[PDB]
Write a protein that binds this ligand. Structure first.
Ligand SMILES: CCCCCCCCCCCCCCCCCC(=O)O[C@H](COC(=O)CCCCCCCCCCCCCCC)COP(=O)(O)OCCN
Ligand SMILES: CCCCCCCCCCCCCCCCCC(=O)O[C@H](COC(=O)CCCCCCCCCCCCCCC)COP(=O)(O)OCCN
Lengths: 250, 250
């Protein structure tokens, strides 16, 4: 009941089959990891003897999608040794701050991935397609969705102890806070894209005429941003939140 | 949350305060029913000595929103005799098959409502504006949103034991099959409007050139309709179920 988490789709421009891991699709608790390590073992077996590439859609991956240390460990010890080696490339799409922080929390186990040239962090579906068969990227429909009909606010500033220059992209279904400055994730300076589904925007608050707060469900401390067009960001987010509430279950 | 189930809002053209019962908001059971009924009491007591009106929002009212028999019967006794007589009108909006059936099954308890000139079914969402001014109307925003941007397919035919002419209206978040011909609900000829949120539309089938089926969640029997433009109705519905799925929870 988890053939959607890890599916095969496409071939790379280097001539290797592509396998997608939708991190958000997997849930720690419920979809027993025993079940996913199973399915990944099974769709890879026929392939991991020869070289293959992986695309991990870290899109909106959060703590509920995590690999607990015991599980995460089992992943670096449960495959034929060549199997790890034949992974020609692992495109990491939509890495966000939680996965990064997860990546730091589990640096003990992800030590091998640090600096690994094989991990290519990708910014958009278009940059991932370049490494694929005539740009036929099969990122989930859901993922690709987040890329269209976006109201983008550049030069925004996420306020925190460390201020992060970000662009706040408001899409009909989610707000994405794409960092404009790179930060390290597994030793590679990459852009982070934090996605906040309208369903998760509990409160939007305009602090100043150029600063707003975004309370995201279950993330406690609201996010804070500074931007010249704040009134407009807030209004766009409220709209998206409202259009969402209208279609809420009874 | 019982608090959004029944609330006071507006005054009718006849100068009577209106109360809205949003059926879908109630969930059958134990305590919800007495929260709900203790709530309607605390809300109505101030007004039920003078003529007041009720708009019953039956949109999407299904089994999970029903008043079990013992709970329903409390509604006809727990209020003062004058409270019942003071209801000058009960606008019934979006009555649907299930409710029709529910009232058929409780045809006994509902004898007092059967034939009642005080019950006004709103078969034309605009007809409500004939007893209550739009600015005084306060149907849930969600109920109202189901009326906007509807791709309407008139002259459809719903096959079943009895084939009823219907209009299939696909909106961004739902499919509504509105009977084109009236049926009796509590002795009144009215237009039912069954609503199927994209969230409930499991299987979508193009049975042939001018026919299609919808399999609805928790509804073993499939909705089978006929229409010239079926591939268009199937595509329309497939688009919204898909638009939905591509925006649901990881
Ligand atoms: C063996 C699987 C690796 C699982 C990694 C889980 C943690 C990911 C954290 C998010 C950022 C990194 C995503 C991409 C990780 C790619 C790791 C990789 O390349 O593993 C190679 C093998 O690649 C594969 O096995 C193919 C891919 C298998 C599925 C991977 C699914 C990753 C799911 C991540 C979920 C998000 C994080 C969850 C958070 C709480 C082998 O590495 P090695 O040679 O250093 O190993 C030495 C010991 N054997
Ligand atoms: C007393 C409350 C009536 C509850 C009716 C529940 C069943 C409704 C079934 C759906 C179609 C009808 C909806 C409108 C019903 C209006 C009933 C009404 O007018 O009651 C009058 C009183 O009106 C009011 O009390 C004000 C409104 C109170 C809230 C009503 C909420 C209705 C909720 C229906 C939920 C949908 C059905 C659930 C299904 C399984 C008094 O009638 P009477 O003089 O014959 O009574 C004699 C004995 N006392």
């Amino acid at each position: 009941k988890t053939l959607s988490i890890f599916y095969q789709a496409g071939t790379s421009k280097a001539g290797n089959p592509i396998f997608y891991y939708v991190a958000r699709r997997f849930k720690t608790g419920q979809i027993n990891g025993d079940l996913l390590i199973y399915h990944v073992l099974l769709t890879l077996k026929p392939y991991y003897a020869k070289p293959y590439e992986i695309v991990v859609d870290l899109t909106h991956t959060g703590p509920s999608n995590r690999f607990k240390t015991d599980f995460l460990s089992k992943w670096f010890v449960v495959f034929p040794g060549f199997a790890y080696d034949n992974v020609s490339a692992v495109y990491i799409y939509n890495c966000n701050s939680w996965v990064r922080e997860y990546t730091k929390y589990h640096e003990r186990l992800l030590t091998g991935l640090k600096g690994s040239k094989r991990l290519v962090f990708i910014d958009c579906p278009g940059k991932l397609a370049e490494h694929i068969e005539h740009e036929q990227q099969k990122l989930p429909a859901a993922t690709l969705a987040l890329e269209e009909d976006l109201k983008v606010f550049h030069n925004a500033l996420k306020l925190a102890h460390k201020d992060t220059k970000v662009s706040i992209k408001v899409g009909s279904t989610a707000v994405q806070v794409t960092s404009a400055e790179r930060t390290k994730v597994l030793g590679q300076s990459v852009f982070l894209n934090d996605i906040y589904y309208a369903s998760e925007i509990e409160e939007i608050c305009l602090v100043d005429e150029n600063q707003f707060t975004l309370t995201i469900a279950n993330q406690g401390t609201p996010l804070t941003f500074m931007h010249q067009e704040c009134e407009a960001i807030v209004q766009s987010i409220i709209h998206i939140r409202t259009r969402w509430e209208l279609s809420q279950p009874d």
